[PDB]
């Protein structure tokens, strides 16, 4: 614990450089490069380690601006030591200038302000004052004070910019009748009248409506009738399209249930006869299945079972069970250690351990709860599973096999056979571990 190493760790900051003379008794070496002064006043530097004699020391009183402290407080994530350092520099506080002023006398002079000490024991006093200065800057004190004053000054600034700081009348008769026309047309066309002084949005509305003749020709009534007519055909076509599409939807539902009940062969044959009839997607496939290939009752049950599935889907829409929200918190990622316990809280609602081939069902309500591959995927995600170790393990849940050679669309991803969810994707093997050691 000699003085030399204390002076050595004094060297670390950009403050307190060294004046060096070849004829003295002090001898310390720096830890890094240091920019130093000399007698005769030459500004030089020294490398990381080099024997340098100490004539004396100078702590510079760097003068910052309050704007720098305000900028750091705007950042608001600085250690109290740095904030206090700058505040003392920016004349906002009076700590460094107090712990210093151990000057023996003004025995040396340069540009910047600072405390100068060139002796044998007052340098020890300087070192003690510097160490105690940063001890105060690091301690519990000066941390309440600087943080509080920074918060107060930021709040006062917000008050400065917050608390201390912050026409048409009547149109013309021509535009009066034009705005009357627009008011009457508003309930008839996608136009809303405004009252701007420049008349310009009105001009764009009239131009867009394809009828600017109101301005000079008093023939607005024929355009009003034209707009009423056009709205009428628009509504008629819209309703016709809605009826057509609901008919198409019901017919496709009927044919899908036919496919799921009586098989692909009979369903595709009935599609063939309907295709060479121009009546596909029309519920006369009911009559076709009645008088063809089976009895009327086997189609009556199809209709009733369609209505049953519709009722079941409506009931599922009406569902407000607890499990549903839980599933959402299982599908948000969000801190694996929490989704693991979410899965724990969900798995208590299973019924028959539902290993494979079908959905898990909720005992509380009765509808589907969670596909098993989702459970396995959550377990692997919480179990530090790599993508390859996750893609291969979720292969017993692989979707439809070579049963379908292809659907004319090239796919690079596997899907779950239980629900259809995408398990993973495979394009090419990585083959980068082939170069080993």
């Amino acid at each position: 614990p000699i003085e030399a190493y204390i002076r050595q760790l004094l060297v670390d900051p950009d403050v307190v450089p060294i004046v060096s003379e070849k004829k003295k008794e002090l001898r310390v070496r720096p830890s890094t490069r240091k920019e130093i002064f000399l007698i005769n006043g030459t500004h030089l530097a020294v490398p990381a380690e080099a024997p340098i004699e100490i004539y004396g020391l100078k702590l510079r009183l760097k003068t910052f601006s309050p704007q720098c402290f305000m900028r750091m407080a705007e950042i608001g994530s600085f250690s109290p030591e740095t904030l206090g350092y700058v505040a003392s520099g920016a004349n906002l506080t009076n700590f460094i200038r107090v712990f210093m002023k151990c000057v023996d006398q003004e025995t040396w002079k340069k540009n910047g302000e600072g405390v100068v000490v060139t002796t044998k024991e007052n340098i020890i006093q300087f070192t003690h004052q510097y160490i105690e200065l940063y001890k105060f800057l690091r301690s519990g004190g000066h941390s309440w004070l600087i943080n509080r004053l920074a918060e107060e000054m930021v709040h006062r600034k917000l008050d400065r910019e917050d608390q201390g700081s912050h026409e048409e009348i009547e149109p013309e008769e021509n535009i009066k009748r034009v705005i009357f026309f627009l008011k009457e047309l508003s309930t008839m066309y996608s136009v809303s009248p405004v009252f701007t002084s420049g008349y310009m949005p009105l001009l764009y509305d009239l131009y867009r409506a394809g009828y600017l003749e109101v301005l000079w020709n008093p023939v607005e009534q024929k355009f009003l009738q034209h707009a009423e007519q056009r709205e009428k055909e628009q509504m008629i076509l819209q309703q016709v399209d809605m009826k057509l599409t609901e008919v198409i939807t019901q017919a496709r539902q009927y044919f899908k249930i036919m496919e799921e009940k009586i098989g692909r062969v009979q369903s595709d044959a009935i599609r063939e006869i309907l295709t060479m009839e121009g009546k596909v997607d029309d519920p006369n496939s009911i009559l076709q299945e009645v008088i063809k290939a089976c009895g009327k009752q086997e189609a009556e049950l199809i209709t009733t079972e369609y209505l049953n599935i519709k009722k079941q889907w409506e009931l599922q829409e009406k569902n407000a069970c607890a499990h549903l929200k839980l599933v959402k918190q299982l599908r948000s990622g969000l801190q694996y250690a929490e989704l693991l316990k979410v899965l724990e809280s969900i798995r208590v609602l299973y019924k028959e351990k539902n290993n494979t081939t079908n959905w898990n069902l909720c005992k509380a309500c009765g509808f589907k709860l969670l596909c098993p591959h989702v459970d396995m995927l959550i377990q692997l995600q919480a179990a530090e599973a790599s993508y390859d170790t996750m893609r291969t393990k979720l292969m017993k849940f692989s979707g439809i096999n070579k049963e379908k050679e292809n659907n004319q669309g090239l796919i690079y991803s596997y899907f779950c056979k239980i629900c259809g969810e995408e398990l993973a994707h495979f394009i090419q093997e990585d083959r980068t571990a082939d170069v080993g050691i």
Partner: protein, 335 residues
């Protein structure tokens, strides 16, 4: 401590239409969901007091999601833990052959890393709770954590002290600033006064630097505690009323100030002299009255909070007598 702070952030609004229906309510709810209970910007946020300024709900420009964002400048009550601070409730969680981890049960969620190389903390029991003294190191505030990382050790009262040479006194503003500190002192002191004296004096006597076998009920009409040793003919001076009169400007604060081990630390009294009669092994620290006043008041705050937390946690005789091997180690190191 527990103090106010101001933060700036940017929030992502998934559905701007629903969000804009009640902007203030949604903003407070989202800020509480995101930032409450986590470490961010060298602090641990406890509560979101409010939003001072905010930006219009912009629409994100660099993607086709139609999602929104908002710049929020909000004021929040947070906790910053300093060095050499007292925590009187630290439950030991991990005591292995490598390292010791304890958890605090106070309003400053902090994990304590106690080095298992000192005879005080080498032998303990998992599940035991113990007061902990923080080392002279900054408390780590890793962003996104639920706790503050800081090293510490079991608090053994020390035998040393410091002497402050004050040569410049206060002004009016520099005393109105310390008015907040004396307000904290009086609040903690009322908290002390609203509680029974038996465990107060037990803890204060047990954490006295020397051995207090005699019983005394020393009173100041504002602070109550057991009396200990004196220093010859020197009579303490109450720093609270001292600072009050200094604000009234009918007293001079210049001279030597000291807080010796024999002195009643949690009391608002300390020693002042015109010349050092103290047999201190450390050189006097040349300074003004700001630094000495703030340090002494912070020390009084720390010790008052320490005693209050000790009495809050240990309610009956079972709690105090369960950990009596820590307390035995405490008596084993007093003069």
């Amino acid at each position: 401590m527990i103090d106010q702070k101001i933060f700036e952030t940017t929030l992502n609004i998934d559905d701007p239409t629903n969000f804009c229906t009640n902007v203030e309510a949604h903003l407070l709810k989202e800020l509480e969901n995101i930032y409450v209970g986590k470490c961010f910007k060298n602090s641990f946020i406890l509560n979101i007091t409010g939003v001072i300024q905010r930006s219009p709900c912009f629409i994100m420009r660099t993607n086709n999601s139609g999602r929104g964002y908002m710049h929020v400048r909000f004021s929040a009550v947070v906790s910053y833990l300093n060095a050499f601070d007292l925590i009187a409730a630290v439950k030991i969680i991990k005591n292995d052959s490598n390292i010791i981890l304890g958890e605090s049960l106070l309003t400053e969620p902090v994990t304590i890393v106690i080095p298992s190389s000192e005879s005080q903390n080498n032998v303990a029991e998992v599940g035991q709770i113990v007061p902990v003294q923080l080392a002279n190191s900054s408390v780590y505030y890793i962003p996104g954590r639920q706790q503050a990382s800081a090293t510490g050790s079991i608090f053994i009262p020390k035998h040393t002290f410091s002497v402050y040479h004050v040569q410049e006194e206060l002004t009016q503003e520099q005393a109105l600033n310390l008015t907040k500190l004396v307000n904290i002192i009086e609040m903690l002191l009322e908290s002390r006064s609203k509680k029974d004296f038996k465990q107060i004096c037990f803890f204060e006597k047990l954490y006295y630097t020397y051995s207090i076998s005699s019983d005394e009920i020393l009173d100041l009409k504002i602070w109550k505690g057991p009396k200990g040793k004196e220093m010859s003919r020197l009579k303490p001076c109450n720093v609270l009323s001292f600072l009050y009169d200094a604000l009234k400007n009918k007293n001079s604060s210049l001279g030597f100030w000291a807080r010796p081990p024999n002195l009643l630390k949690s009391s608002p009294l300390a020693y002042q002299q015109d010349q050092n009669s103290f047999n201190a092994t450390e050189l006097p620290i040349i300074c003004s009255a700001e630094v000495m006043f703030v340090t002494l008041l912070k020390e009084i705050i720390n010790y008052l909070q320490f005693i209050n937390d000790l009495c809050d946690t240990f309610n009956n005789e079972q709690l105090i007598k369960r950990h009596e091997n820590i307390w035995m180690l405490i008596e084993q190191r007093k003069i």
